[PDB]
Amino acid sequence: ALVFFAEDAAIIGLAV
Amino acid sequence: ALVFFAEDAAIIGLAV
Amino acid sequence: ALVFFAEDAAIIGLAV
Amino acid sequence: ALVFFAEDAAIIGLAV
Amino acid sequence: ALVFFAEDAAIIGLAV
Amino acid sequence: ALVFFAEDAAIIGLAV
Amino acid sequence: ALVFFAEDAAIIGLAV
Amino acid sequence: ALVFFAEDAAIIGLAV
Amino acid sequence: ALVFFAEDAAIIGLAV
Amino acid sequence: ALVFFAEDAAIIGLAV
Amino acid sequence: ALVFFAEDAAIIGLAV
Amino acid sequence: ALVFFAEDAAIIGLAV
Ligand SMILES: [Cl-]
Ligand SMILES: [Cl-]
Ligand code: NA
Ligand code: NA
Numbered sequence: 001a002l003v004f005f006a007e008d009a010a011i012i013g014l015a016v
Numbered sequence: 017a018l019v020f021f022a023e024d025a026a027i028i029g030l031a032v
Numbered sequence: 033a034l035v036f037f038a039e040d041a042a043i044i045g046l047a048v
Numbered sequence: 049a050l051v052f053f054a055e056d057a058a059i060i061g062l063a064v
Numbered sequence: 065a066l067v068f069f070a071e072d073a074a075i076i077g078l079a080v
Numbered sequence: 081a082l083v084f085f086a087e088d089a090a091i092i093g094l095a096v
Numbered sequence: 097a098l099v100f101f102a103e104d105a106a107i108i109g110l111a112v
Numbered sequence: 113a114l115v116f117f118a119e120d121a122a123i124i125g126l127a128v
Numbered sequence: 129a130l131v132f133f134a135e136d137a138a139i140i141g142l143a144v
Numbered sequence: 145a146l147v148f149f150a151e152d153a154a155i156i157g158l159a160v
Numbered sequence: 161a162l163v164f165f166a167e168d169a170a171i172i173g174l175a176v
Numbered sequence: 177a178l179v180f181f182a183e184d185a186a187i188i189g190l191a192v
Binding site: 052053054055056060 | 066067068069077
């Protein structure tokens with residue numbers, strides 16, 4: 001799967 | 017809101 | 033075009 | 049994180 | 065299927 | 081335009 | 097609702 | 113950034 | 129496949 | 145138009 | 161919820 | 177990367 005990084009602050013990974 | 021990073025070069029933030 | 037970065041491991045660029 | 053709401057009847061949250 | 069809601073005003077459903 | 085409502089917490093509108 | 101125009105050939109509207 | 117076009121009528125740009 | 133258009137300037141076609 | 149498949153159980157088509 | 165199938169190789173289900 | 181399948185008729189793969 002792919003993990004997209006994003007700022008939510010903290011950096012999080014969005015897994016797909 | 018989340019900020020996705022992308023190369024446009026410079027790094028920019030895409031606000032959602 | 034924009035290049036999104038994602039962890040696939042190694043970091044890859046997704047061109048759009 | 050964002051939570052999108054959707055009727056699946058019943059309301060569910062789609063977490064991102 | 066899922067029904068997403070949006071304000072178009074009136075609330076509408078987007079079916080998927 | 082459309083406004084999607086999501087929980088960001090607080091309920092916010094994403095305008096498109 | 098919004099209509100997106102895309103080539104499918106002919107250029108058609110995708111309704112949302 | 114990219115600008116996608118959509119029919120709202122007017123033809124608008126959705127900027128990304 | 130669908131070809132989405134966007135202004136990048138020049139109009140570009142994104143193939144899907 | 146494209147048809148994406150998804151398990152909704154039965155397998156259905158999502159038309160775009 | 162819908163389950164999209166995708167090749168990651170193995171076939172996996174993406175749940176929404 | 178992920179490959180989504182779709183009917184375009186032949187079945188095609190969308191690479192990501
Ligand atoms: Cl920026
Ligand atoms: Cl899943
Ligand atoms: Na907010
Ligand atoms: Na920048």
